[PDB]
């Protein structure tokens, strides 16, 4: 929803801050948000490769359209949706942001944000809602 757009902005801001970039280019939600930040960190610790293959497959330019992104993120979900995969979906957005800023393409950041939120609303929310909503996400990772 607007709520999902806000989860995504939070997470990406959190990740940009953490890694010493700027974030200026942009039941409770707060509990969801803290759960997600922590989820991200935890997951990035276990796999430090930063989806280099996936970022390579995308290789985002300002001419890159949503449909290309969607195809790449789909790769994450070959075997269906997961709590863990959603988290990877979030990290992936973060890496892509970082990678954008590194390439003096900080304009892509809020676009990636919109794409992520479209993707989540369209492809991810349905499974979320079906498996207990973000409450359950909280129970799990909180």
From Swiss-Prot:
Motif stretch (BH1): 75-94
Disulfide feature: none
Keywords in alphabetical order: Apoptosis, Cytoplasm, Cytoplasmic vesicle, Cytoskeleton, Membrane, Mitochondrion, Mitochondrion inner membrane, Mitochondrion outer membrane, Nucleus, Phosphoprotein, Synapse, Transmembrane, Transmembrane helix, Ubl conjugation
Mod. after translation: Proteolytically cleaved by caspases during apoptosis. The cleaved protein, lacking the BH4 motif, has pro-apoptotic activity. This phosphorylation is partial in normal mitotic cells, but complete in G2-arrested cells upon DNA-damage, thus promoting subsequent apoptosis probably by triggering caspases-mediated proteolysis. Phosphorylated by PLK3, leading to regulate the G2 checkpoint and progression to cytokinesis during mitosis.
Topology class, membrane: Single-pass membrane protein
GO biological process: apoptotic process; apoptotic process in bone marrow cell; cellular response to alkaloid; cellular response to amino acid stimulus; cellular response to gamma radiation; defense response to virus; dendritic cell apoptotic process; dendritic cell proliferation
Main subcellular localisation: mitochondrion
Domain of life: Eukaryota
Places the protein is found: Mitochondrion membrane; Nucleus membrane; Cytoplasm, Cytoskeleton, Microtubule organizing center, Centrosome
Motif BH4 boundaries: 3-23
Distribution of this protein across tissues and organs: Widely expressed, with highest levels in the brain, thymus, bone marrow, and kidney. Bcl-X(L) and Bcl-X(delta-TM) expression is enhanced in B- and T-lymphocytes that have been activated.
UniProt short sequence motif BH2, positions renumbered to this chain: 126-141
Cellular component terms (Gene Ontology): Bcl-2 family protein complex; centrosome; cytosol; endoplasmic reticulum; membrane; mitochondrial inner membrane; mitochondrial matrix; mitochondrial membrane
Single GO term (MF): BH3 domain binding
Family, per entry: Belongs to the Bcl-2 family.
Subunit relationships: Homodimer. Interacts with BAD. Interacts with PGAM5. Interacts with HEBP2. Interacts with p53/TP53 and BBC3; interaction with BBC3 disrupts the interaction with p53/TP53. Interacts with ATP5F1A and ATP5F1B; the interactions mediate the association of isoform Bcl-X(L) with the mitochondrial membrane ATP synthase F(1)F(0) ATP synthase. Interacts with VDAC1. Interacts with BCL2L11 (via BH3). Interacts with RNF183. Interacts with GIMAP3/IAN4 and GIMAP5/IAN5. Interacts with GIMAP5 and HSPA8/HSC70; the interaction between HSPA8 and BCL2L1 is impaired in the absence of GIMAP5.
Biological role stated in the UniProt entry: Potent inhibitor of cell death. Inhibits activation of caspases. Appears to regulate cell death by blocking the voltage-dependent anion channel (VDAC) by binding to it and preventing the release of the caspase activator, CYC1, from the mitochondrial membrane. Also acts as a regulator of G2 checkpoint and progression to cytokinesis during mitosis.
Domains as described in the record: The BH4 motif is required for anti-apoptotic activity. The BH1 and BH2 motifs are required for both heterodimerization with other Bcl-2 family members and for repression of cell death. The loop between motifs BH4 and BH3 is required for the interaction with NLRP1.
Name of the protein in question: Bcl-2-like protein 1
Organism whose genome encodes this protein: Mus musculus
Parent-protein start and end of this portion: 2 to 196 of 233
């Amino acid at each position: 929803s607007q709520s999902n757009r806000e989860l995504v902005v939070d997470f990406l801001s959190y990740k940009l801050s953490q890694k010493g970039y700027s974030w200026s280019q942009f039941i409770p939600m707060a509990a969801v948000k803290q759960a997600l930040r922590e989820a991200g960190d935890e997951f990035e610790l276990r796999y430090r490769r930063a989806f280099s293959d996936l970022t390579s497959q995308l290789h985002i330019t300002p001419g890159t359209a949503y449909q290309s992104f969607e195809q790449v993120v789909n790769e994450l979900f070959r075997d269906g949706v997961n709590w863990g995969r959603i988290v990877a979906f979030f990290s992936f957005g973060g890496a892509l942001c970082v990678e954008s800023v590194d390439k003096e393409m900080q304009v892509l950041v809020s676009r990636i944000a919109s794409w992520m939120a479209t993707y989540l609303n369209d492809h991810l929310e349905p499974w979320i809602q079906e498996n207990g909503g973000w409450d359950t996400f909280v129970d799990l990772y909180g």
